[PDB]
Amino acid sequence: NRRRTWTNRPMYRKPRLYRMYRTPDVPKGCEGPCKVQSYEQRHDISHVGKVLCVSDVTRGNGLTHRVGKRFCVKSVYVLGKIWMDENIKTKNHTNTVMFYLVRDRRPFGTAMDFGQVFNMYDNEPSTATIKNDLRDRYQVLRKFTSTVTGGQYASKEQALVKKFMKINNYVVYNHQEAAKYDNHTENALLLYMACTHASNPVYATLKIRIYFYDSVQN
C-alpha cells in the first residue's frame, strides 16, 4: 500500500493523498513524503580541515529528488566511524575530529574551505568560532567531537560516530538542477570536519543522511 501508491502515482506529480492531507511528521508550509538523501564517503581529515555540502539534492519526480526550488530539511543523521590508518596508529598521539554542522544564510562559490570562515589561533580547530565579519552569514547549528588515540602496543584505532540532529531548515535553489553547492540561492547546510592533532591525519567513513520535505510556499 505504501509502495504501490508511489509507483502508481499520476505522471508528473505526487500521490493524491499527500496533496490532500498533512501528517504531523511534515513541517509547516512544506508537504509530501519525507524524502531522504545520503552521502556515503571516506573523508580524509586534516588539521587544515575538510568541507562538504549536505543539502546537495537534485530536482525530479521521484524520491531523493526536490520538486521545486524550495524545500525544508527537517533532520540530519550523521553515522559511521572515524579511524586511524595502520601505519599511523603505531605512533603514540591523540586526535579529536571536530565536526561543525553550519548554515550559511547567503551562500555562493564552490566551497568556503575550513579556516576561511572559522577564526582560530595557530590554525587550531578546537579554538574555532565564526569570523567577526561572516558571523552574520554563517551560524553553527551543531558541533560535536570524536576522540581517537594511537599507540605502539596499545591503541584506540577507531571511534563510532552516531549523531541524529533535528534542525528545521528551509533552503532555496536556482531553477537549474545539479545537486551542487553553487546552485543554492538561500542557505545551505555545510558539514566542516577538522583533526585536532597537527601532523598526522585520520580517516572518517561516514554516511551523512538528510531528511527533507518539499515546500508549498511561494
Partner DNA sequence: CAACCAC
Partner DNA sequence: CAACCA
Q: Which listed residue (29, 34, 207, 216) binds a copy of itself by CB under 8 A?
A: 207
Type of residue found at 176: Q
- State in angstroms the smallest separation of the CB of 74 from DNA: 6
**CB contact at 8 A, 52 and 110:** no
Judged by beta carbon, residue 37 or residue 88, the one nearer DNA is 37
Q: Which is nearer to a copy of itself, 108 or 164 (CB)?
A: 164
CB of 77 to DNA, least distance (A): 5
Residue type, position 175, single letter: H
Residue 217 binds DNA, judged by CB under 7 A? no
Whether residue 99 contacts residue 192, with contact meaning beta carbons closer than 8 Å, is answered with yes
Q: How far is CA 202 from the centre of its chain?
A: 19
Backbone φ, ψ for residue 17 (5° rounding): -55, -50
Fill in the amino acid letter for 30. Answer: C
Q: By CB under 8 A, which span of 97-105, 123-131, 170-178, 206-214 interacts with a copy of itself?
A: 206-214
Q: How far apart are the first and last CA of the chain?
A: 32
Considering only 7, 87, 132, 218, the residue that binds a copy of itself (CB under 8 A) is 7
CA distances from 201 to 21, 43, 119, 151 (A): 50, 11, 21, 15
12 within 8 A of 65, measured Cβ to Cβ? no
Residue 152 binds a copy of itself, judged by CB under 8 A: yes
Footprint of a copy of itself on this chain (CB under 8 A)? 2-3, 7-12, 36, 38, 40-42, 60-62, 64, 79-81, 89, 151-158, 160-162, 205-207, 209
Footprint of DNA on this chain (CB under 7 A)? 1-2, 25, 33-34, 36, 63, 74-75, 77, 79, 105, 129-130, 135-136, 139-144, 164, 209, 211
